[PDB]
Design a protein around this ligand. Structure first.
Ligand SMILES: *O[C@H]1[C@@H](O)[C@H](n2cnc3c(=O)[nH]c(N)nc32)O[C@@H]1COP(=O)(O)OP(=O)(O)OP(=O)(O)O
Ligand SMILES: *O[C@H]1[C@@H](O)[C@H](n2cnc3c(=O)[nH]c(N)nc32)O[C@@H]1COP(=O)(O)OP(=O)(O)OP(=O)(O)O
Ligand SMILES: *O[C@H]1[C@@H](O)[C@H](n2cnc3c(=O)[nH]c(N)nc32)O[C@@H]1COP(=O)(O)OP(=O)(O)OP(=O)(O)O
Ligand SMILES: *O[C@H]1[C@@H](O)[C@H](n2cnc3c(=O)[nH]c(N)nc32)O[C@@H]1COP(=O)(O)OP(=O)(O)OP(=O)(O)O
Ligand SMILES: [Mg+2]
Ligand SMILES: [Mg+2]
Ligand SMILES: [Mg+2]
Ligand SMILES: [Mg+2]
Ligand SMILES: [Zn+2]
Ligand SMILES: [Zn+2]
Lengths: 647, 224, 222, 221
RNA sequence: AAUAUAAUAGUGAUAUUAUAUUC
RNA sequence: AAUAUAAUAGUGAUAUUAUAUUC
RNA sequence: AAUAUAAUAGUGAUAUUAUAUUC
RNA sequence: AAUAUAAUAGUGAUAUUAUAUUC
């Protein structure tokens, strides 16, 4: 191995036993820094003593990568490397696994949970901690929970030995600071969270660092919105006719905006609490209102999609929607709405088949891609968009475009509800830096709004000299946001370089002050009468709160053979094992093919049981009759009977 | 009020009144039903609007007479001769008893008998312990719904958990059950709920039982 | 991933629980064969039970490679993969390390020494054993020592449950045999050393294999 | 349909705790036993199975319990058998124990078979139920079995041990002249059965007193 | 043949008897 | 999934439904 | 179920949606 | 320190060397 000088320079404060936040550009090879710090830390101990290192990776790919590298590197030195992730965390002696290994790679939630249970009594068992992407240490994030434990031990009278804390990040961030001084405050608070007395940056060796990681040139493309909407002109008529149908049953803002989305969601939640003496009629009209607001929401989504993409993509979005609706079953209301939609279908497809209507944004994007690939046919591009719908949209737009034929698109999204041939990779977003992918000498941000940290991190894809990053937007605000983010970066670097000049002792004192203050701030009746849980769509009786049991102070299940008649089920599209639970199938409302999503069906220990979310139900008090809606089970306040296997 | 009881069954409370409402049965069940009338003075009414039913059970009474008379005849025979005749009949029956169609390997299509939706392929169908038929692949899982079984039972090595129905446009036709078999959680389907379309030919045929359906039946292997 | 048919064919005798010597050309992807057999072995157990697989690599590079691949493969399925080599073997609770992990990669000398020391009381702790380059099982080689323990337990009076044994080799070897009968005897003795009742080779799928591993033309320059 | 106090008495046992169940005669301890056994057998995962042994000290109680358990657990797929002095001889006791989930025994059978060696350890059972457990003391067969249990526990055998459930209407204070000595005797009895819990009816007492009434006692001198 | 309980004698281990059970 | 019985069409093997049972 | 980020509404604790992650 | 392979000398057990590996 042959480490670069700036890596030794960055690792030097940590090797001196100083708690250190290491701030260096993305792709500078921080992994080697970690290896150096750990190697020195482990080899520094005398014979009668030994060190224990814990590395925190926030995402599974980084987890496996780091575990592999550390194992391959430190096996020859006589240090056992292991790891505990969510998959392997259950039914294993975590305490022994920690005790029997020198280097342990961990996702932070494991440590938070094991500290909370008490299986790992103290953080004193580790002599060194390393936080990957340490800028995440703040608020309620698992990192910050770990550090809550740490600081609770430090500031307390336990007087147990504490591990050296080493953070790693490309950007510490200035937060919401409007000026350099406030930025200094934020950074100091972050250093207090990680108990770090030193911020390590490349200074002496900068000339070496700049020959490795290069800063890509950033261009701002400000375009115009499409001049005339025929599509929105006619679909506003379907929104109007749908809210007119809603205007029949009600007894009681712009289209294509987030304001309308908020409004229609609040309306949808308002329709669920309406009540009548006749309950079946109530179910009919509530199902009706739910369906109307749903179609309204989908239409709105179509408007937005076509604002940011082709009108064909919005049309196909609606067509996919109604395809699914047809798959659901025949409902009078759904059949009606689909009918009125199908009446306007000819006119619609007439209006997106025209070449005249192509949006200025896609034209400009096409121009960018054309020019850049004309100059360099070997160009690898990465295209960031806000939503997955837009991912599919541009995916189809590229190969549906004859001029873009040189492009070989690919898809990168999340899992949940050069030498290869992919020239361009369309993606939503990637948490922090992540695993290094192929170097993109072209980065296109399409209506992208990030923070300063994500801005600095996205440069890691542009490490090569001559990389370029375009920001294409019709909003004209986005430009300003990115600019003030650049200014935020300036504030950050300046404040850091100012902090580095302070005497370390004084800084430790300020840090201790902040920590104690934050600890002071941090240290600062359930209803017993039965409630009913009704479907949010068809208002059908699902459960009684007397039948609800709480597993592990988190998940909620139902007891009795009565509930088994209220739901149907189909195998889960994305089977996943969370905690001690194993997902098997999805459960839906069984009454008259309502099919509203109630929750999941899981295997827990020996039991096969349903788990429901309060978000999908309406809570009716038997005594008062008052119906209420609830965020999550945390905000629903009633006495929750623990799940008892012997019951 | 009851439907029927196989043979004598467990001994019930004595009924001095037994009423047969449009009831038709054999001689054996006739003689067995008397067991509920053991006490003196018990009565049995046969109530029907059919001039036939009465006739049925009186020819049954005649059958009983024939039975008793025949037994009384057999009891007069010499045991050796009876053994000989019995042996003769046994050998005959064994001779008659001691006295397979070529399977089709063409891939068929199992369609829902109700909505004609494609459910399964005969390449996906695997047979467990010569009797029960399952469907492999994740393709099938999107074709069916499931409801918790109203009467869960354990038969042989299988445990019933849910009933499975058609998923398309709320067809909800009964395709079979969903069971726990050894380590595996797997669906079991009945051929009587499906129509077989060989789309090489395009011909649709109906089978009531699996053993009357002759195609290539591959054994279920845990090693697949 | 997408396994080639001859790999499934080679793994099939092992997935049926038979102790099996797998004999296939070098570079046919035996790694994925091991992954297949191991995955099937671990997933076959009911809920209340679990298996323990031990992989024997004779060399440190092979040790690290296999440990890495197995770790990256089986972490998602909820199986802990670890290893013990000469560097990490000292002053560690080897028994606990074996106990607390589902898949364990060892250099054979660790198991030999720890069996002799008594820290590992029996091979009954493993439900499966895989020998890389299993032709090395003979004479005083560590593999053969391990198998001496195995066979002493098997042929001994009190015998607990024994692990399935899978060997992996490109060539079993004929020894010094001058004819097919002596060769047959050598191969049978090797199978006896590994307690293997089956020798798995590629037969049905030969064309596919010959499209992957080609036999180089050999010239002799005198 | 069980009475509430029966569930209350069964609850500590169903939680896996070694328990001495103390309730008045006639409260229906049989159903308590049935509940404990049922929950104990059903709690095991697929790859494992439990084995329950029920000690009845007298042949009538032996036959009664055997009949009741056989009739009750046949449905759930648990084979119930028994061994008394009549059928104890010239039979493979080890196989009979191995091949059945619930085994009803008179204590002498298990003592004899333990010291003979046919049953190597009590680890073969996942649950033990002593009927009239107050009899566990001195040289009584119950106490001999428990001597095997404790010899295994306090030793370095490191084998798994069965959950122990006693059943009695009275534990007894022995010769105790005061509450302290009584406490000591009861503690020693708990030690004998390795029980950390004594289950009595508390919440449901009013229901229990509608079932078993206390008769009036007169003294004629 | 073993075990339990009660009475009695003995400082006690125990001993006698009565009663019951088990193998 | 198998088995038995009854009614019903067929000369019959069978077939449909009903009823019951077993694995 | 928890967490983070972004936009939107609100003076704010927050709320909605979007995106991503973890257990 | 142990193990394997190859060549060699010897009828063989082995022995020398070469080579590789492991603890
Ligand atoms: O020493 C005793 C013993 O060896 C033998 N004996 C008599 N009954 C039993 C028994 O129930 N169990 C065992 N193991 N051994 C037994 O008889 C010897 C003495 O004879 P007894 O006269 O005392 O016994 P008997 O049957 O004549 O009288 P009883 O015991 O019924 O009252
Ligand atoms: O083909 C049948 C069969 O394989 C299986 N099956 C259902 N019940 C049993 C049984 O009692 N014994 C055996 N050996 N096999 C059984 O199910 C397949 C058909 O499913 P069904 O829908 O007909 O079964 P279901 O439970 O839904 O109805 P029912 O027979 O109990 O009344
Ligand atoms: O209330 C939730 C929760 O109890 C449970 N649940 C589902 N996924 C998880 C998980 O990853 N981690 C934890 N701790 N708990 C989980 O399901 C209830 C809600 O059901 P959902 O319909 O939201 O779950 P579903 O799988 O359908 O959607 P998603 O998990 O993919 O987002
Ligand atoms: O007798 C040997 C032995 O006791 C000891 N020794 C040296 N290396 C090892 C080893 O790798 N493993 C074991 N078990 N024992 C070892 O040294 C004695 C002989 O010393 P050498 O001069 O022959 O060894 P050296 O390190 O000088 O050279 P080398 O081992 O590379 O050949
Ligand atoms: Mg191979
Ligand atoms: Mg298992
Ligand atoms: Mg060796
Ligand atoms: Mg079980
Ligand atoms: Zn509903
Ligand atoms: Zn259908």
């Amino acid at each position: 191995f042959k480490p670069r000088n700036y890596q030794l320079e960055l690792a030097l404060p940590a090797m001196k036993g100083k708690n250190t936040i290491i701030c260096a550009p993305t792709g500078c090879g921080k992994t080697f820094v970690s290896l150096l710090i750990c190697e020195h830390h482990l080899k520094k101990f005398p014979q009668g003593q030994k060190g224990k290192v814990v590395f925190f990776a926030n995402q599974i790919p980084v987890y496996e990568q780091q575990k592999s590298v550390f194992s391959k590197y430190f096996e020859r030195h006589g240090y056992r490397v292991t790891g505990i992730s969510g998959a392997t965390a259950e039914n294993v002696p975590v305490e022994q696994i920690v005790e029997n290994n020198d280097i342990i790679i961990l996702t932070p939630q494991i440590l938070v949970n094991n500290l909370k249970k008490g299986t790992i009594p103290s953080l004193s068992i580790f002599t060194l901690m390393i936080f990957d992407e340490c800028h995440n240490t703040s608020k309620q994030h698992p990192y910050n929970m770990i550090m809550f434990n740490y600081l609770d031990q430090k500031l307390g009278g336990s007087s147990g030995p504490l591990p050296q804390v080493i953070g790693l990040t490309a950007s510490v961030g200035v937060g919401d600071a409007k000026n350099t001084d406030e930025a200094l405050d934020y950074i100091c608070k972050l250093c207090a969270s990680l108990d770090a007395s030193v911020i390590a940056t490349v200074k002496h060796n900068l000339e070496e660092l700049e020959q490795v990681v290069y800063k890509p040139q950033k261009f701002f493309r400000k375009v115009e919105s499409r001049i005339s909407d025929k599509f929105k002109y006619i679909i506003a008529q379907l929104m109007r006719d749908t809210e007119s149908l809603a205007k029949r049953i009600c007894k009681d803002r712009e289209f294509g905006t987030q304001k309308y989305e908020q409004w229609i969601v609040t309306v949808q939640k308002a329709c669920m609490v309406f009540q009548m003496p006749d309950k079946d009629e109530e179910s009919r009209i509530c199902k009706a209102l739910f369906l109307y607001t749903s179609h309204l929401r989908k239409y709105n989504d179509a408007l937005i999609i076509s604002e940011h993409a082709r009108m064909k993509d919005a049309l196909d979005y609606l067509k996919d929607f109604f395809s699914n609706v047809r798959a659901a079953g025949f409902d009078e209301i759904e059949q009606d709405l689909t009918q009125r939609f199908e009446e306007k279908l000819q006119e619609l497809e007439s209006v997106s088949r025209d070449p005249s209507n192509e949006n200025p944004k896609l034209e400009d994007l096409c121009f960018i891609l054309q020019e850049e690939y004309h100059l360099n046919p070997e160009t690898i591009t990465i295209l960031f968009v806000k939503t997955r719908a837009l991912v599919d949209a541009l995916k189809n737009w590229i190969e549906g475009n004859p001029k873009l034929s040189f492009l070989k698109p690919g898809i990168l999204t999340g899992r949940g509800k050069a030498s290869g041939d992919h020239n361009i990779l369309i993606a939503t977003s990637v948490a922090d830096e992540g695993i290094d992918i192929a170097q993109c000498n072209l980065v296109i941000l399409y209506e992208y709004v990030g923070n300063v940290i994500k801005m600095i991190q996205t440069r890691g894809r542009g490490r090569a000299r001559g990389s370029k990053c375009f920001l294409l937007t019709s909003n004209a605000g986005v430009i300003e946001k990115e600019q003030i983010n650049m200014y935020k970066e300036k504030m950050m670097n300046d404040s850091i370089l100012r902090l580095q000049t302070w005497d370390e002792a004084v800084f430790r004192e300020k840090i201790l002050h902040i920590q104690t203050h934050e600890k002071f701030i941090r240290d600062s009746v359930p209803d017993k009468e039965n409630k009913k849980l009704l479907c949010r769509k068809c208002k059908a009786l699902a459960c009684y709160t007397a039948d609800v049991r709480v597993i592990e102070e988190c998940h909620y299940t139902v007891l009795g053979d009565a509930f088994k008649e209220c739901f149907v089920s189909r195998p889960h599209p994305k089977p996943k094992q969370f905690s001690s639970f194993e997902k098997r199938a999805k459960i839906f409302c069984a009454r008259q093919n309502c099919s509203h999503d109630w929750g999941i069906h899981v295997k827990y220990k020996t039991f096969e049981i349903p788990v429901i979310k309060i978000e999908s139900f309406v809570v009716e008090d038997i005594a008062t009759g008052v119906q209420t809606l609830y965020s999550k089970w945390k905000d629903f306040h009633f006495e929750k009977i623990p799940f008892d296997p012997a019951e | 009020i009851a439907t029927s009881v196989a043979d004598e069954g467990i001994d019930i409370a004595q009924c001095n009144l037994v009423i047969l409402y449009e009831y038709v049965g054999n001689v054996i069940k006739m003689i067995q039903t008397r067991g509920r009338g053991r006490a003196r003075g018990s009565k049995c009414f046969l109530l029907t609007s059919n001039a036939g039913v009465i006739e049925k059970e009186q020819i049954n009474m005649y059958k009983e007479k024939m039975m008793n008379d025949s037994i009384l005849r057999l009891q007069t025979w010499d045991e050796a001769v009876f053994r000989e005749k019995i042996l003769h009949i046994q050998t005959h029956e064994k001779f008659i008893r001691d006295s397979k169609p070529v399977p089709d390997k063409e891939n068929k299509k199992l369609l829902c008998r109700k909505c004609k939706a494609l459910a399964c392929y005969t390449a996906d169908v695997r047979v467990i312990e010569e009797c029960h038929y399952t469907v492999l692949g994740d393709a099938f899982k999107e074709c069916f719904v499931s409801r918790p079984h109203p009467k869960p039972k354990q038969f042989s090595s299988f445990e019933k958990r849910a009933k499975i129905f058609c998923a398309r446009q709320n067809c909800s036709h009964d395709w079979g059950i969903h069971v726990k078999y050894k380590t595996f959680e797997i669906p079991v389907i009945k051929i009587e709920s499906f129509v077989v379309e060989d789309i090489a030919t395009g011909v649709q045929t109906l089978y009531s039982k699996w053993k009357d359906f002759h195609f290539e039946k591959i054994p279920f292997d845990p090693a697949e």
